[PDB]
Design a protein around this ligand. Sequence first.
Ligand SMILES: Cc1cc2nc3c(=O)[nH]c(=O)nc-3n(C[C@H](O)[C@H](O)[C@H](O)COP(=O)(O)OP(=O)(O)OC[C@H]3O[C@@H](n4cnc5c(N)ncnc54)[C@H](O)[C@@H]3O)c2cc1C
Ligand SMILES: Cc1cc2nc3c(=O)[nH]c(=O)nc-3n(C[C@H](O)[C@H](O)[C@H](O)COP(=O)(O)OP(=O)(O)OC[C@H]3O[C@@H](n4cnc5c(N)ncnc54)[C@H](O)[C@@H]3O)c2cc1C
Ligand SMILES: Cc1cc2nc3c(=O)[nH]c(=O)nc-3n(C[C@H](O)[C@H](O)[C@H](O)COP(=O)(O)OP(=O)(O)OC[C@H]3O[C@@H](n4cnc5c(N)ncnc54)[C@H](O)[C@@H]3O)c2cc1C
Ligand SMILES: Cc1ncc(C[n+]2csc(CCOP(=O)(O)OP(=O)(O)O)c2C)c(N)n1
Ligand SMILES: Cc1ncc(C[n+]2csc(CCOP(=O)(O)OP(=O)(O)O)c2C)c(N)n1
Ligand SMILES: Cc1ncc(C[n+]2csc(CCOP(=O)(O)OP(=O)(O)O)c2C)c(N)n1
Ligand SMILES: [Mg+2]
Ligand SMILES: [Mg+2]
Ligand SMILES: [Mg+2]
Lengths: 576, 576, 575
Amino acid sequence: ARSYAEQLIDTLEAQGVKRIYGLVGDSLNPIVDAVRQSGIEWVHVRNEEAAAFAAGAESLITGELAVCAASCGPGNTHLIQGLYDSHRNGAKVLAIASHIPSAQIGSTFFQETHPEILFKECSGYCEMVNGGEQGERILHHAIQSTMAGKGVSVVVIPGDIAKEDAGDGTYSNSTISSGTPVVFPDPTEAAALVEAINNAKSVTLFCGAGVKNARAQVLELAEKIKSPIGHALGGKQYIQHENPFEVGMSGLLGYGACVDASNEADLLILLGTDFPYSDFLPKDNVAQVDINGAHIGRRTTVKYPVTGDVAATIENILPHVKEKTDRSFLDRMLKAHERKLSSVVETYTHNVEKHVPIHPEYVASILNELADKDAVFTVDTGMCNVWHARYIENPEGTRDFVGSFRHGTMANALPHAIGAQSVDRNRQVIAMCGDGGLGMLLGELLTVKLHKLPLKAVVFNNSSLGMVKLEMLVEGQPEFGTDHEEVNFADIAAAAGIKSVRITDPTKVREQLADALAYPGPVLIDIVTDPNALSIPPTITWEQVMGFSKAATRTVFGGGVGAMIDLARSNIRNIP
Amino acid sequence: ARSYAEQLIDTLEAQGVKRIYGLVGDSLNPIVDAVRQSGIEWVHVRNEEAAAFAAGAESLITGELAVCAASCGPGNTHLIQGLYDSHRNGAKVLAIASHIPSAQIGSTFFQETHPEILFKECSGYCEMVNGGEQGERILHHAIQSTMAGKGVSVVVIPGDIAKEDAGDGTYSNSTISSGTPVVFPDPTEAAALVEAINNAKSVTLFCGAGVKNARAQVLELAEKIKSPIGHALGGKQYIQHENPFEVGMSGLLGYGACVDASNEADLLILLGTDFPYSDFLPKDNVAQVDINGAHIGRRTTVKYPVTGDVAATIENILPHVKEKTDRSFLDRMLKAHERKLSSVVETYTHNVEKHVPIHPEYVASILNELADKDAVFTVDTGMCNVWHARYIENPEGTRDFVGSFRHGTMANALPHAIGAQSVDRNRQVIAMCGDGGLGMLLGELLTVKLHKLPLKAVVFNNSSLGMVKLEMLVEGQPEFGTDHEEVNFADIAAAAGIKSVRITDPTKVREQLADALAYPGPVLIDIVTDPNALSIPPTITWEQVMGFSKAATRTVFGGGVGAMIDLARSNIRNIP
Amino acid sequence: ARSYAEQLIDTLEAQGVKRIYGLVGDSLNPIVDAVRQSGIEWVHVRNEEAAAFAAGAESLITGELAVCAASCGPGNTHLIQGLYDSHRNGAKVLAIASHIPSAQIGSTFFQETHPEILFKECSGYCEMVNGGEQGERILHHAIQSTMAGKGVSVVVIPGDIAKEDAGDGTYSNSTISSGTPVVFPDPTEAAALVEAINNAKSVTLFCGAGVKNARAQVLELAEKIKSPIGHALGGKQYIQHENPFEVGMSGLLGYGACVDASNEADLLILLGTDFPYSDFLPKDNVAQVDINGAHIGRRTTVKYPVTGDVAATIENILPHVKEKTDRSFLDRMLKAHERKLSSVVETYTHNVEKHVPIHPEYVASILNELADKDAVFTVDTGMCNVWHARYIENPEGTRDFVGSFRHGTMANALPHAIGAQSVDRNRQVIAMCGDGGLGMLLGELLTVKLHKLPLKAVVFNNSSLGMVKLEMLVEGQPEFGTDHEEVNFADIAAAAGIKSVRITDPTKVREQLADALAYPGPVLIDIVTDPNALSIPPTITWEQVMGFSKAATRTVFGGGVGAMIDLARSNIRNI
Ligand SMILES: Cc1cc2nc3c(=O)[nH]c(=O)nc-3n(C[C@H](O)[C@H](O)[C@H](O)COP(=O)(O)OP(=O)(O)OC[C@H]3O[C@@H](n4cnc5c(N)ncnc54)[C@H](O)[C@@H]3O)c2cc1C
Ligand SMILES: Cc1cc2nc3c(=O)[nH]c(=O)nc-3n(C[C@H](O)[C@H](O)[C@H](O)COP(=O)(O)OP(=O)(O)OC[C@H]3O[C@@H](n4cnc5c(N)ncnc54)[C@H](O)[C@@H]3O)c2cc1C
Ligand SMILES: Cc1cc2nc3c(=O)[nH]c(=O)nc-3n(C[C@H](O)[C@H](O)[C@H](O)COP(=O)(O)OP(=O)(O)OC[C@H]3O[C@@H](n4cnc5c(N)ncnc54)[C@H](O)[C@@H]3O)c2cc1C
Ligand SMILES: Cc1ncc(C[n+]2csc(CCOP(=O)(O)OP(=O)(O)O)c2C)c(N)n1
Ligand SMILES: Cc1ncc(C[n+]2csc(CCOP(=O)(O)OP(=O)(O)O)c2C)c(N)n1
Ligand SMILES: Cc1ncc(C[n+]2csc(CCOP(=O)(O)OP(=O)(O)O)c2C)c(N)n1
Ligand SMILES: [Mg+2]
Ligand SMILES: [Mg+2]
Ligand SMILES: [Mg+2]
């Protein structure tokens, strides 16, 4: 550790960092020279935006720090979309934003920007290096902030300072606190929750991503109080599989009896969720358990706020919660859930398997069956979120899911898959791409080829901004600016040196997709899908689609559901 | 004009806006519905970053307002790179940044960002619409700010407010002031400049972009005081052609006797330039005429500061400037200029027509000769800046040039060409692309096909981040992270439906390029060039290449020059 | 110039800076040591907010750079109110914001703030020094930015870097461009304005602060086209005095026939004004000449925009403007102006000399007569803005006026007077203070005493937030939170060592104010005034007072006017 660049790389390497995603240039050159000499791999991308998405996806998969790096001015500026996504997803990311020479700061120099100001909204820590010793210190603070769960950390490094001497080791010698504290609730809040539960004749649990390490506790509580369990999109991968109390998801992409179970129960308990669609939530009698107190009551009236961890709160309250022997509400909701899903399959999916262009719901149904039990699925923003929510299951809980569920950016699927795949080349990674999303960052097909990343990019090629076509249908606005001439992604992937398949016949989807998923290397599957595979109830308004309608609602987008119906049916047969 | 969305489009249409570049979505839907009903064309791009670059390039070509538009959160976030470039270039751009519903602001909603804060550095005006009447007002202020020369204007529009009623017309009915005032200098400042000129036995003029409308005045002054004229890269297109006093350019990409003429004259006059490389500038006796007083003395010691327009200042001082009958310095500099260029052609261009892989300087030389006399040239940041500076000329001043000369971003050439070509489809547009730059925004090949834009994309495919390889060579750092496996851009362009040519044999460059430039439609010419076509003097340091070396320098990068030698030679024959 | 602190002070001294207002501490210590060794005077204030107001007022008086300086974190944070005011007023100010040691930046250290981010809104240039050479460079850029008219410049200096070596002199050796370019309009815009003027049978000129160096041109144009001349508050000190076309001011504090002349003329020409009250402006046929093109059309419909200097634009268009021999509109507006002012004096100033508690309008009338012909007047935000506008005149144009007319902060009068008075101790400076404004920065009475600044602080002590009481009256809201127990500012000023007078009897105002203004040294005159000296027409709404009412209006606050009526009457001669 002689220069600050060398010390920064030695510090990252000592903490277990295995790769840095980025694009070399100017102020970043001394850092990449240190990378070359180290055991850290340099992962070259075509656009720095993909490096920030890849680091965010890698972190979500590993639970460890991930790093992206970019050159001065326009170089680090490109990181921004990926940093907002990684930040909203709570990924542990350190972004090395190289900066113009310090002597040029404030002189309107060539490539001058102020990244230390620009990145404030997409980060929990964002400071500028002004010397080697201070640089070592703020590198520690950036790492310690993101490892403590404060979101993205940005370190802004003027290129001349990267070549100055390293600090004396005081801050790089530290052990980073990366543990998970056990957050028990305030007894007063837990007591009010116990009383609310005991006073209620019927209770519904609505779970989000905060339920990640509380499956056993949520299920034990549900068995005791006979409560149906619904979920937000972020809670789907953790609480839906093998759940005897399963009642679906809320929101426009929702399914089953979740909205009804949530609005008809005496008490609704929000468990680790920040579900933003308030019009689907009741206001009369709601409790909320959230580890971040500032998030409580953000989405609806909350009468019983509880600041705490889901598993710890449930373990604390369980001895005081009385066993409810009455299952009437639960049985009634389980039956209504199965009827709603059966009705949805009959209304929108009957005999659709031979319609041309190919129905995307048929593709997603096959994709769910053919993908490995431990595959990583990345989901591009748009109609692919509808197909993932209703057709991609997580049996045994061994699959991983990376998407832009909060920032809602298009084009995330391929760069997220690049990061996810880099962690382990022997694990299957499926990128559910949109044609719009892929075309937005098309040059990342060159990155997949360069690094020989064996991901399977499944393009739902509807030649449309599918989700926008749906919005305009809801508004009543004539279709404009959404659908354009067809693009052949299989030929583009082949021209870039990637094995490709084009699927246009629905009777060939199963076999061609099976062949592609089995191929030992990168594959792009270009599936020509129907952009008009949409069914929207006439009562849905533009205000509802945009998320600002206040009136109570239970209406979801039309369309079918997949393999989730098998659990719904098995739960009906298992009613005592 | 019933809604604010309709009034905004009616206002832009009444001001002569012919097209809006963007990508439809969510909050932007009511605005694009109004576009559909209007005479304005909607130009769909694959990535919103290209819309902001295209609007910037269109404005630089027309001298009128240009408009880009993007959806909420991640949509408008993509505009940022293009807005920094358009802002630094002084383009007249209005960016419509659609925003999340106003009821959701402050609630950490799905896709929430604060564009009104994020865009402050890349704009002269950036405000949020909070109602219809105020929206009409700030739309006027945004347009009036950018039309007055204050740079990019951003109007942040929450989607719900786009559907509310329009204002009463008070601000939309205004005539926008788009005139160019005539800025005469302060008599005290002008008098000190007269004295400095009269006391000097030899004077050199160093011109930048501010000399755009002062060619006659610069030339008249130069004939009176016998002064050689040099230029910054931004002044090249205006002052180099048919200039009997021409002595080249300064900086690392420079050529000819400019650095010598500038440092050896008794007085150096900076005329409309903000040339950032201080180590190439003298400090002892410098005068500076700039229309923005805050820019004076930003780059070197200035003893005679003059706040004013170049043409007006020169016309004011001319009757008081005594005629210099001594041409010794001018003749000496004209001869030294021609010798330096002749030496550079002999040293670096010997057998260039047979060099394999194809020498980029040979390509640029052919390109200059074959392109139309009125073509628009767009230049990708990197080695293409070296080839444009030394080989692409502007005879008669009828050609236009769009590049990222100030913000210095990669990937600008194709999106700049999309904007420039949309102005007039009967005018030739050449995009000098880098392989790095093209791969960074590769999906814009789909935009060229979609809009049938007949631009000629000339890819200097060296399979390298050429400019970074140069930086590492100068530093002494082992080559790492710059060169990767070859990519076939002709096959990618053909797979996207674009006519393409792959050139690998130098003896075929002239014929294949001539055939391609003549084709009536979009063409991608993939030229396999040599990444090692670099000649760097051993004295150049990393500090110099990064722009923070303070010691005086006259050293430029090795390499030849093109057709500029013909004017240098004709000026020798015209010496009395 | 061995250290950056020494070089910074040498550069300021070489540019003619005579004093720096501030408060020494921590990171600012090496800079104040360099001030001590230099010919620059250190002016200690009690609160750094007063240093920024004082620099802003000094600059407005001299037309030159003025400097304020403050310590790290909380020290420079106090500058902020004064910097927003100096910035809105277009003052040429350099703010030296000392900062925490560079090694501590990013570590949540004791006193840590980010002034380089905090001050972006109240400045045209704001950067952080990271080393001696770069510090010299950004010092140049900061000075050159504010001297070119871009507003306040802030230089953020980490204390450790102040002691590191100075730069090599390249940027400090430069000559700063402080000239005034001559901005002629675009011929196309000027030609459209000529046509608009020639087509109009009647024209009104409405002037703001941009008319400062164009009096001769405005008057020559007015004589040619027979146009009445009105003004915004910012234009009052330049265009009202000895004006044969004078028709008053617009807005709620307005007077005379200005609103009528502006809305009844065939063409209204806005000349160097950014008057923000759109409801008083017509929309049908308006032209605007402004040196900053981005300001055109900001307040009303403008059909004839002209980017350019007022004097240059007028000189350029004059040979093409045809002489108007018809004076009908001008005579009708001159007569209506005199009638309106006469009516206002009869209605609201009857028996004002005997009114108890003392009427502030009677005080302002006496103050205008007793103050020197070249006095500087500083005006606290609130009811004092009404009294200054309607009673304080500028005969011969030798008086100066400093106020918070744009940022609208209370408490500016005393600190602005401190800066104005420091320029020349032989010149009279009158601070028209509010009791609210004085109480807000009361510790600056200690600064006046310390520096023996012979300013005359005239406190309009109404025991109220007078302007807020007016707002609640207009809204119909019951009076609450505005009026409190009386404070004796004369006793407080005397306890601080300052000669003071307390005036409670209206019959004593003239003699006590004459004695006080004649006193050779600082004086605080505590005048017990009536907080209910308000006459508000019943149609004035809360939306109007707040500035967001859309409907066209010609209504002004009731109340009299002063010595301005003598010009209105003299202008009626030859009717
Ligand atoms: C096109 C599109 C459409 C969408 N439509 C829908 C839709 O119809 N329905 C839907 O449900 N989603 C939808 N989403 C996603 C939606 O916007 C939200 O992002 C999502 O509902 C949030 O899920 P969540 O509550 O699990 O996650 P988050 O919003 O991340 O909330 C997790 C919460 O748990 C808390 N927490 C974390 N750890 C713990 C712990 N140990 N103990 C306690 N609390 C903890 C956190 O503090 C946080 O408040 C859509 C996304 C896209 C891209
Ligand atoms: C990879 C790369 C390498 C580069 N290398 C070099 C190099 O070696 N050499 C080089 O020269 N450039 C180089 N450049 C560009 C360089 O960074 C600057 O952008 C350029 O030198 C500025 O040119 P300019 O002074 O003409 O333009 P600007 O920087 O835009 O300056 C124009 C000036 O004129 C003033 N002005 C405008 N209108 C008027 C008027 N009517 N009257 C008076 N003043 C007016 C403006 O206020 C401004 O200060 C490089 C760019 C890239 C991308
Ligand atoms: C309590 C209170 C009440 C107020 N009430 C009123 C009221 O009733 N009436 C009123 O009039 N004001 C009122 N004001 C002040 C008001 O808010 C504005 O600040 C004022 O009207 C603006 O005056 P102005 O146009 O002269 O100045 P500015 O707003 O500073 O405008 C000057 C303009 O001239 C331009 N300019 C500058 N130099 C030149 C040049 N050489 N050539 C051409 N253009 C140039 C500038 O670009 C600018 O646009 C009040 C203030 C306070 C504190
Ligand atoms: C960067 C960005 N631009 C725009 C949007 C708005 N948006 C959301 S979904 C969508 C369409 C996505 O099209 P595609 O990726 O092809 O998916 P589809 O819905 O057609 O399956 C758009 C424009 C966004 N979320 N992000
Ligand atoms: C967005 C961005 N990232 C990084 C840089 C730094 N940089 C400047 S030139 C260059 C290489 C450009 O490569 P290419 O486009 O292939 O052009 P070449 O120099 O090889 O001709 C890089 C990385 C930049 N200017 N902009
Ligand atoms: C710092 C600040 N706080 C509050 C206001 C709002 N305000 C404007 S005038 C005024 C009352 C001023 O009272 P005083 O200074 O006593 O003057 P008066 O109007 O009573 O003459 C107030 C509260 C303001 N302009 N600035
Ligand atoms: Mg699609
Ligand atoms: Mg290249
Ligand atoms: Mg008061």
